[PDB]
Amino acid sequence: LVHVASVEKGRSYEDFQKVYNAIALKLREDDEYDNYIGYGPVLVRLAWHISGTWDKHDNTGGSYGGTYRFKKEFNDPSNAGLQNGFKFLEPIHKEFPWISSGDLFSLGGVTAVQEMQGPKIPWRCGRVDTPEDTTPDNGRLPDADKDAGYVRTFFQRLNMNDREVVALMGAHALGKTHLKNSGYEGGGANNVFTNEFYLNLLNEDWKLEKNDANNEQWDSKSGYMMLPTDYSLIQDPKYLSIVKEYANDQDKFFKDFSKAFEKLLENGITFPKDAPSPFIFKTLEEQGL
Ligand code: HEM
Ligand SMILES: Nc1cccc[n+]1CCO
Ligand SMILES: Nc1cccc[n+]1CCO
């Protein structure tokens, strides 16, 4: 199954930078969401979940087809809460109706990471919307109540290795869990992209507790939480090494996250040899906007 990137007709970097800018300006404007976290984190999660359905064995799922717009996928229990991200992006899509749905969703994630002071994420256009019957079934996104072996195995389906898994998980510095979405209870409130997930894993005094949904999670007296799968990265000795690395090298963590996130967003897509080079968008701050 081959998905060839096809550039939205006549569009170039300047067009996509405007889209970026509209998302970034809305991020700035719609500040009260989720107790003043803003929409950055949920947009990152959205870009991950639209990509994380991919199966390297048959090239089903993945970001390309924009299939999150179809009820089967948007109603996936694993996607509960992401409707907020969608509603955020709908006015952007109405203003720029020419962008494909997979391009918009993945660009929303790029824009969110950058505007939250994360690394640059090169991004490529050309995802093309595919029909409802190409929507992957529910159940391809990961469970949070398991160990390191589950995590490793899960991510082989996405062609991610240990360093890529540990790097991508660093996005769990952002935002929070919400009991009514996932059964995890978060207070958390960060909307700045840093390497603190790793620092928190190593530094905090974690206690295995049960939340009000009767699920276990790891909590600290500082008010932080970790999912069991987040904690598994310090149980497994191969993941632990890499957690320590990223805790001790902000820059390394940035570059590794950038390449892993781009790869995640691009899995399943064939880029023609004549395709444009990846775009690196300027932040609002960089533009003086
Ligand atoms: C083992 C892998 C993963 C598991 C089990 C997992 C699980 C979860 C769960 C249960 C939540 C809370 C959802 C809610 O209650 O609203 C969450 C949130 C979040 N996840 Fe993950 N995740 C994983 C990997 C990733 C990856 C790879 C990324 C992106 C690179 C990501 C980005 C996020 C973000 C940014 C949030 C916060 C959303 C918000 O604040 O609304 N996660 N994840
Ligand atoms: N080690 C383990 C065993 C079972 C479920 C989850 N985890 C991960 C951390 O709590
Ligand atoms: N662990 C986790 C997972 C997802 C979002 C937030 N947090 C808390 C901060 O690390």
Side-chain angles (χ1 to χ4, degrees), residues 172-177 197 200 224-227 230:
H172 283 178
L174 301 170
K176 67 180 178 190
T177 68
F197 171 77
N200 286 342
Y224 295 108
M225 64 79 76
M226 293 288 174
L227 303 163
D230 287 330

mmCIF file of all heavy atoms in Angstrom, residues 172-177 197 200 224-227 230, ligand 3:
data_model
loop_
_atom_site.group_PDB
_atom_site.id
_atom_site.type_symbol
_atom_site.label_atom_id
_atom_site.label_comp_id
_atom_site.label_asym_id
_atom_site.label_seq_id
_atom_site.Cartn_x
_atom_site.Cartn_y
_atom_site.Cartn_z
ATOM 1 N N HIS A 172 5.597 14.046 27.208
ATOM 2 C CA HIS A 172 4.831 13.965 28.433
ATOM 3 C C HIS A 172 5.238 14.979 29.453
ATOM 4 O O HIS A 172 4.611 14.994 30.537
ATOM 5 C CB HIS A 172 4.778 12.538 28.992
ATOM 6 C CG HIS A 172 3.837 11.655 28.268
ATOM 7 N ND1 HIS A 172 3.642 10.333 28.553
ATOM 8 C CD2 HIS A 172 2.966 11.967 27.280
ATOM 9 C CE1 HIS A 172 2.623 9.900 27.791
ATOM 10 N NE2 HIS A 172 2.222 10.848 26.995
ATOM 11 N N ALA A 173 6.214 15.836 29.218
ATOM 12 C CA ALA A 173 6.354 17.049 30.022
ATOM 13 C C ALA A 173 5.185 17.973 29.866
ATOM 14 O O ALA A 173 4.943 18.854 30.740
ATOM 15 C CB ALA A 173 7.630 17.799 29.611
ATOM 16 N N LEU A 174 4.459 17.858 28.768
ATOM 17 C CA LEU A 174 3.416 18.813 28.387
ATOM 18 C C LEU A 174 2.052 18.406 28.923
ATOM 19 O O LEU A 174 1.671 17.250 28.891
ATOM 20 C CB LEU A 174 3.274 18.860 26.894
ATOM 21 C CG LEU A 174 4.558 19.264 26.117
ATOM 22 C CD1 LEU A 174 4.332 19.038 24.647
ATOM 23 C CD2 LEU A 174 4.950 20.719 26.396
ATOM 24 N N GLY A 175 1.281 19.416 29.323
ATOM 25 C CA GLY A 175 -0.177 19.194 29.540
ATOM 26 C C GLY A 175 -0.415 18.276 30.719
ATOM 27 O O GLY A 175 0.364 18.217 31.683
ATOM 28 N N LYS A 176 -1.476 17.487 30.564
ATOM 29 C CA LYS A 176 -1.936 16.643 31.648
ATOM 30 C C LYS A 176 -2.848 15.511 31.214
ATOM 31 O O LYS A 176 -3.374 15.478 30.120
ATOM 32 C CB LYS A 176 -2.628 17.478 32.753
ATOM 33 C CG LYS A 176 -3.933 18.132 32.351
ATOM 34 C CD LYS A 176 -4.488 18.927 33.557
ATOM 35 C CE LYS A 176 -5.786 19.678 33.276
ATOM 36 N NZ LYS A 176 -6.179 20.653 34.393
ATOM 37 N N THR A 177 -3.030 14.594 32.160
ATOM 38 C CA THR A 177 -4.069 13.605 32.016
ATOM 39 C C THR A 177 -5.360 14.176 32.629
ATOM 40 O O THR A 177 -5.323 15.055 33.431
ATOM 41 C CB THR A 177 -3.681 12.272 32.687
ATOM 42 O OG1 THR A 177 -3.628 12.442 34.106
ATOM 43 C CG2 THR A 177 -2.312 11.788 32.190
ATOM 44 N N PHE A 197 10.562 16.149 31.777
ATOM 45 C CA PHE A 197 9.976 14.805 32.031
ATOM 46 C C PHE A 197 11.045 13.878 32.620
ATOM 47 O O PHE A 197 10.825 13.140 33.533
ATOM 48 C CB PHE A 197 9.451 14.274 30.711
ATOM 49 C CG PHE A 197 9.002 12.851 30.661
ATOM 50 C CD1 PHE A 197 7.756 12.449 31.196
ATOM 51 C CD2 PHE A 197 9.788 11.864 30.072
ATOM 52 C CE1 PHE A 197 7.318 11.174 31.056
ATOM 53 C CE2 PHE A 197 9.307 10.577 29.950
ATOM 54 C CZ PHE A 197 8.069 10.223 30.512
ATOM 55 N N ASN A 200 12.216 14.948 36.120
ATOM 56 C CA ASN A 200 11.176 14.570 37.104
ATOM 57 C C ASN A 200 11.211 13.066 37.383
ATOM 58 O O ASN A 200 11.176 12.615 38.514
ATOM 59 C CB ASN A 200 9.834 15.025 36.576
ATOM 60 C CG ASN A 200 9.632 16.530 36.680
ATOM 61 O OD1 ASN A 200 10.322 17.202 37.428
ATOM 62 N ND2 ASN A 200 8.695 17.046 35.940
ATOM 63 N N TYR A 224 3.315 16.084 40.894
ATOM 64 C CA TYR A 224 3.551 15.494 39.558
ATOM 65 C C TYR A 224 2.944 14.085 39.502
ATOM 66 O O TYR A 224 2.769 13.423 40.531
ATOM 67 C CB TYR A 224 5.031 15.415 39.161
ATOM 68 C CG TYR A 224 5.716 16.760 38.994
ATOM 69 C CD1 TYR A 224 6.650 17.203 39.916
ATOM 70 C CD2 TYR A 224 5.454 17.561 37.874
ATOM 71 C CE1 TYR A 224 7.288 18.454 39.742
ATOM 72 C CE2 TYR A 224 6.050 18.799 37.710
ATOM 73 C CZ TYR A 224 6.968 19.231 38.643
ATOM 74 O OH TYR A 224 7.577 20.469 38.450
ATOM 75 N N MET A 225 2.732 13.604 38.278
ATOM 76 C CA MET A 225 2.291 12.241 38.072
ATOM 77 C C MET A 225 3.009 11.677 36.837
ATOM 78 O O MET A 225 3.426 12.422 35.915
ATOM 79 C CB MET A 225 0.741 12.087 37.953
ATOM 80 C CG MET A 225 0.106 12.748 36.804
ATOM 81 S SD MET A 225 0.263 11.817 35.231
ATOM 82 C CE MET A 225 -0.951 10.514 35.451
ATOM 83 N N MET A 226 3.105 10.363 36.843
ATOM 84 C CA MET A 226 3.619 9.544 35.746
ATOM 85 C C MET A 226 2.686 8.367 35.511
ATOM 86 O O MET A 226 2.218 7.727 36.478
ATOM 87 C CB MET A 226 5.005 9.032 36.030
ATOM 88 C CG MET A 226 6.040 10.112 36.087
ATOM 89 S SD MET A 226 6.459 10.829 34.472
ATOM 90 C CE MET A 226 7.547 12.174 34.961
ATOM 91 N N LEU A 227 2.428 8.084 34.257
ATOM 92 C CA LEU A 227 1.717 6.884 33.941
ATOM 93 C C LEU A 227 2.618 5.700 34.243
ATOM 94 O O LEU A 227 3.848 5.815 34.241
ATOM 95 C CB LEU A 227 1.357 6.921 32.487
ATOM 96 C CG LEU A 227 0.536 8.145 32.091
ATOM 97 C CD1 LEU A 227 0.574 8.329 30.579
ATOM 98 C CD2 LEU A 227 -0.959 8.031 32.611
ATOM 99 N N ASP A 230 5.252 5.503 31.773
ATOM 100 C CA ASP A 230 6.233 6.605 31.802
ATOM 101 C C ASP A 230 7.255 6.118 32.774
ATOM 102 O O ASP A 230 8.481 6.231 32.553
ATOM 103 C CB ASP A 230 5.583 7.921 32.261
ATOM 104 C CG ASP A 230 4.702 8.527 31.232
ATOM 105 O OD1 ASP A 230 4.965 8.334 30.022
ATOM 106 O OD2 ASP A 230 3.741 9.290 31.657
HETATM 107 N N1 LIG B 3 3.147 11.898 32.851
HETATM 108 C C1 LIG B 3 2.355 12.697 31.982
HETATM 109 C C2 LIG B 3 1.801 12.097 30.834
HETATM 110 C C3 LIG B 3 1.065 12.882 29.962
HETATM 111 C C4 LIG B 3 0.938 14.283 30.242
HETATM 112 C C5 LIG B 3 1.486 14.762 31.404
HETATM 113 N N2 LIG B 3 2.182 13.968 32.278
HETATM 114 C C6 LIG B 3 2.693 14.596 33.482
HETATM 115 C C7 LIG B 3 3.975 15.371 33.435
HETATM 116 O O1 LIG B 3 5.065 14.544 33.089
#
